[PDB]
Amino acid sequence: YDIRVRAKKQRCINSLGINTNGLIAMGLDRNKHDSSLQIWDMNYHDDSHETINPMFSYCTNESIVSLKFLNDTSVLAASTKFLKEIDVRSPN
Amino acid sequence: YDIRVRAKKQRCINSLGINTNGLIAMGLDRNKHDSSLQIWDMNYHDDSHETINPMFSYCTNESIVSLKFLNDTSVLAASTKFLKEIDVRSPN
């Protein structure tokens, strides 16, 4: 098919990752009212809206520049001043 | 394997549903501070805790007695005084 999606607050996309189980992550620019690491699944996405409702939101007030899915649950994300490995099963 | 799970507020389980894509729903009794229709996935479940973190929470202050997964996203739930079809892609 063909679907176009975007964040709730529109800004430039730096990185992108698709997991093995279809989980999709996204690296955005820095916005003070939104998360720059949005992880969501396309099967549970409302098709009537361009915006995405993320399952997991991380890295608020940060600018993620590169990311890569390590496992089926863990993602390795790089910001402009940090390097993190964030698991979706823990908020820390 | 073998895993035991329960709600954040422990109460009797009335119904249970497993979807085709591995999504698991659950019908509980009536609690005034918790949702009786907890839908969650076991792959994104923290294995160090007995409690479940639900992806979608519905039917607060209600007692769901029977439920059945219609589609990969919609569930048909029955309470003690209502009969609802709740889609996970919309909060209404």
UniProtKB/Swiss-Prot annotation, chains A, B:
WD repeat residues: 8-50
Designated name of the protein: SEH-associated protein 4
Further facts: Present with 184 molecules/cell in log phase SD medium.
The protein's assembly and partners: Component of the SEA complex composed of at least IML1/SEA1, RTC1/SEA2, MTC5/SEA3, NPR2, NPR3, SEA4, SEC13 and SEH1.
Similarity remark: Belongs to the WD repeat mio family.
Portion of the full-length sequence here: 140 to 231 of 1038
Source organism of the structure: Saccharomyces cerevisiae (strain ATCC 204508 / S288c) (Baker's yeast)
Location within or outside the cell: Cytoplasm; Vacuole membrane
Job of this protein: Component of the SEA complex which coats the vacuolar membrane and is involved in intracellular trafficking, autophagy, response to nitrogen starvation, and amino acid biogenesis.
